[PDB]
Design a protein around this ligand. Structure first.
Ligand SMILES: NC(=O)c1ccc[n+]([C@@H]2O[C@H](COP(=O)(O)O)[C@@H](O)[C@H]2O)c1
Ligand SMILES: NC(=O)c1ccc[n+]([C@@H]2O[C@H](COP(=O)(O)O)[C@@H](O)[C@H]2O)c1
Ligand SMILES: NC(=O)c1ccc[n+]([C@@H]2O[C@H](COP(=O)(O)O)[C@@H](O)[C@H]2O)c1
Ligand SMILES: NC(=O)c1ccc[n+]([C@@H]2O[C@H](COP(=O)(O)O)[C@@H](O)[C@H]2O)c1
Ligand SMILES: NC(=O)c1ccc[n+]([C@@H]2O[C@H](COP(=O)(O)O)[C@@H](O)[C@H]2O)c1
Ligand SMILES: NC(=O)c1ccc[n+]([C@@H]2O[C@H](COP(=O)(O)O)[C@@H](O)[C@H]2O)c1
Lengths: 227, 227, 227, 227, 227, 227
């Protein structure tokens, strides 16, 4: 049947009902295919070295996620990436977790949304062969409201298409779209966030005034993709 | 400043993060206008006499809502409508709650989405003067992803436009759209619902297999609008 | 690996390069999945009993198809259905060919575009259990330019969704859309048709002035879906 | 009545049913206006000097067209452009053929699609006066699925608008879109192509493995528009 | 060159800058084709017998047009239609004016917008042969913001397409859309109208409270298309 | 009630009925809110120092506006800005008129379309604090056909959102869109312009051949936003 473990790399600024729902979606999919059984889901907040704009320090991110998942029987956080001194290429993170498992072989597979995927085209953001290796040796599960675009994008690229049998596009009927950005912005304006993220999360947020604008100013100088 | 109390009539089949979020939205709005202060929010599940398709029996609806709101300091359920033997015209429900308050006068105002509003045009669904009275003597707060349409619709009708100063369209940035229907359908197929509704709710649902299809067959014969 | 035989029932008024391309698309898909091997394709024109508007006599339809396929190694016509006295439900046609094969068991699968699919919703056009049996015991392969729509349509139905794992939506990159309707029209107005249909067809058409308008008037009275 | 000859310059990498259909469309239009009589159509593959990416050697391009036109009574190929040692501006080619005819004067008219037309705005791609001369002394026939855009395009340009009476936008009902790019891609992937291009063409292609990807890498360095 | 007269039949409830602009557009087009010379334009308000909803008495309609055209060198009103005691089919009015001219023969051509044209499909609204005659013996000039639609519309109709050479679609860049309906509504609501209609018109309207709503209730019972 | 004076800064190249209608729309809104009373409207053409492309000399702009407003009871031109030696920041112009009023305090408010608004995002075009002061101490009234966009734009910005209660978006039902650009263009090609601009304007334009193309070439070098 092939046990699987879904890895989700991402900034995970304010983790939100969405990211949680993604896991719900991906699972129901693969389980529902018959050729799979989802064993566990891993959230892996990016390190601070990633240096993206408005990226608050990892502790908060890892914490929030954990709080976020406290009540889940299959999704657990995982801090290895957030502690590295140097930013980690997704490929390396995937390998890591796979190698770990090899110490009855659940395949690790990259969980993701459209953006990630489409970001494959950003110049210098990815190592051509990184993409290859990823798609080739570890699956890629993409859950989106924008099914078609995702599928064109694949059609559009020889590398992806060649390994399309390892890429699954999961349709998000019922619109999520609770983007980190919109959530931060709300916070910044004293809006509400309630119901868009898990309570403990909200509460962790409000008692700690985590998102400000002083915060959004963070890292106003080139991310760690430029090699 | 004018204290206000938001009344939300609706089937409230599976109440969901959305309906809860609506209240969050409406409040933040009126409070943010300065000319208002939201005092309390009321959920009022429809009676069974409404006889709409797939409408499971009220007990469940009222319960679920309550569970739904257990943790809210300002939104409370209210069962008066669900007990009436005859289906109640929204106008009558509004009056009720207003009259109740008159026993320092918080104005009751109808909380709602686009559908409701647009349903004003369905033939025989509303008593022309009911609309009038509603809009005239009690406000109408409409939160939507479809701001424009809502505003055209108003522009489109002399009755509404005339009382437009009592109608407020609230823009839903960050897409909700967790419709009851999609949730039921999911349930029916053993999907997940998790994160789209409050846990106690989910749990109440799963321990009780509330939505089936046998259930959706309910009331396959003309609703209570036809007078 | 599972050998497969693609069955395409359809009026096949002027068969056109589209029809032919669908088979080419369908096959490349299945074969390209690894779980399949496309063995042969069958074109089965409707009988005259179907009584659809502008449906010229089977003889012309059957022949044109044959000419159309004369040069194909794997797609052949089949006249069983065009001969029956009474219109035949697609489920019966599927059964027929499957049973004939059972006289090493290639699964017959229904080749299809969106229209047919989406017509499962027209009232009285299909016997609910027919759809079910179809999708359950024989696959459904649907090639379209409208991927998402088709997928929504599936999402939108308990029956289909349930048997989703036997329904494949094949995306048609590169627009076809040479509808029979459009070609009839053209013919009617002395346009061209060349390069939209196979030459032998074009030729058979022009030497026989097959489509007129007197012809389009054919069957101006209720098709044979109405039981 | 004014006899006309339609000239189509273009890379004509895999010539396809589309290209052929264009002629059939343009003709029908002009002839159907009553002001014109289409005498002959000319295919003129671009030279190798053009230095476009993935542009395979001319001889293949010319041969394939010739096979594609073998059975046409009025569309013939023309190799004068493919033999030039320096890339030829479309204006020169137009003159060429016109001059040729002047040795009862059929007007040569440029046949094209939207992209060509829209390329008039690309910086440095065209000599302003070249555009002028073309549109002024030789017509421009543009068949498109994107009628409106084409017409805005004209509206938005003083030069074109001024000579609008010599520009005809021919609407393509029934979708073509068999782009050479799409074809090449398919070929690379072992797809089908059958029924997108004329048979002799496909055969010529299969028996010669003409498109590979090593081929697509051809000319990875600035085309000969930059003067 | 063929001199032409543009005739516009229409309710012309509040005539507006739009109506006037139409003429200016149509003219510019025909004159700009070189095949034509626009001699005069005629406004012909419909009679009261037409029995359209909200159709105020003709005299007001005719007067307002006249004021609206007072300062035009070529567009004049024409009251023959407004005096008839029975509603007149557009075809009869076209004949009328043509006949008139025949007492050097300027062709009368119907000036209109999309809706009119598109109304050709409304059941029972038009006598099939009426359409025929109109389009065949008198041209049809259609200015629209919705160019494409208009052109599909023609493509989709055998009758129209056959006479397409007598139908001209004139594209309206720069949005009009000052619909009489919109105007009336405004008026009812005490809005503005200024700069949507000619000043003498607005003044005529203000000094006469012409549009009320009691007025809009006019003719609440089937127009005179139903023969 | 709060008296108000609507200030509209703009190039006012050919002033057009649109410009005039904006004032009509703006006023009906404010007055129709009850919280306001529109006292006067001011048109303030830009100085020549602005140095925008195709900006003909202030004299013509100022005069045309005056002619345009000659017949208005409440909208008057104002030449203060056109006279200054140096281009003037809109904030200064707002201040000026406000200060002049303070010599019973009518609030001056900036009248505006979407473009201006949306240009708050162009880099270096506006001084962040200028926007702030503007929105904070002087309102911003924006009439558009693109309501939502405008509202999103607001949503999308901390600064604007913060002072949202002083920004009103007025919806323009009935399409205007007579852009100066379009009219210039037309003029350039001898089209018409009649009914899009006030007659006295049209007249002043045609007797003076104001717009040419030599004129459009004016200022082909960097506007005065670049500080
Ligand atoms: N070349 C690469 O492997 C590469 C480049 C950019 C981002 N990433 C990743 O994608 C992420 C960014 O997504 P978010 O911005 O939603 O967090 C990361 O989590 C991250 O590690 C990987
Ligand atoms: N004439 C009326 O007042 C009228 C008609 C139809 C529905 N309703 C109401 O709108 C509702 C239906 O909305 P839902 O179907 O989302 O529950 C009700 O809750 C209900 O009471 C009122
Ligand atoms: N209930 C059925 O089995 C059923 C109903 C309608 C059409 N069909 C068929 O599938 C076909 C497709 O028809 P068209 O491709 O001409 O629309 C038919 O030829 C047809 O007979 C089957
Ligand atoms: N000044 C000119 O005449 C000029 C400029 C750029 C391209 N072209 C041409 O238009 C062409 C279009 O070719 P493709 O559509 O296959 O790229 C060419 O074949 C070509 O030579 C002409
Ligand atoms: N058979 C006919 O000639 C025929 C049929 C229906 C409407 N019409 C007409 O076209 C018109 C359009 O008027 P409105 O656009 O204001 O409704 C009429 O004025 C009218 O009389 C003509
Ligand atoms: N920073 C500023 O105050 C600023 C910047 C750009 C334009 N504007 C102005 O507002 C105006 C609107 O310009 P347009 O209406 O011609 O695009 C101007 O006339 C103009 O000067 C002001």
């Amino acid at each position: 049947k092939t046990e699987v473990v879904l890895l989700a790399c991402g900034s995970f600024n304010p983790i939100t009902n969405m990211h949680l729902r993604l896991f719900e979606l991906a699972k129901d999919y693969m389980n529902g295919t018959g050729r799979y059984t989802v064993v566990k889901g891993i959230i892996s907040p990016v390190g601070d070295a990633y240096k993206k704009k408005g990226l608050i320090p990892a502790y908060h991110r890892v914490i929030m996620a954990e709080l976020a998942t406290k009540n889940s029987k299959w999704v657990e956080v995982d801090t290895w990436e957030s502690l590295q001194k140097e930013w980690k290429e997704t490929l390396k993170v995937l390998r890591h977790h796979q190698e770990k498992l090899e110490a009855a072989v659940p395949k690790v597979k990259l969980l993701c949304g459209a953006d990630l995927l489409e970001s494959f085209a950003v110049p210098n953001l990815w190592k051509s062969e990184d993409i290859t290796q990823i798609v080739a040796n570890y699956g890629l599960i993409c859950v989106t409201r924008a099914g078609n675009d995702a599928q064109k994008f694949i059609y559009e690229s020889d590398v992806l298409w060649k390994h399309r049998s390892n890429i699954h596009v999961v349709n998000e009927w019922i619109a999520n779209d609770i983007s980190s950005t919109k959530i931060r912005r709300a916070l910044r304006r004293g809006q509400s966030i309630r119901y868009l993220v898990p309570d403990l999360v909200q509460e962790y947020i409000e008692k700690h005034n985590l998102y400000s604008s002083e915060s959004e100013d963070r890292n106003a100088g080139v991310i760690l993709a430029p090699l």
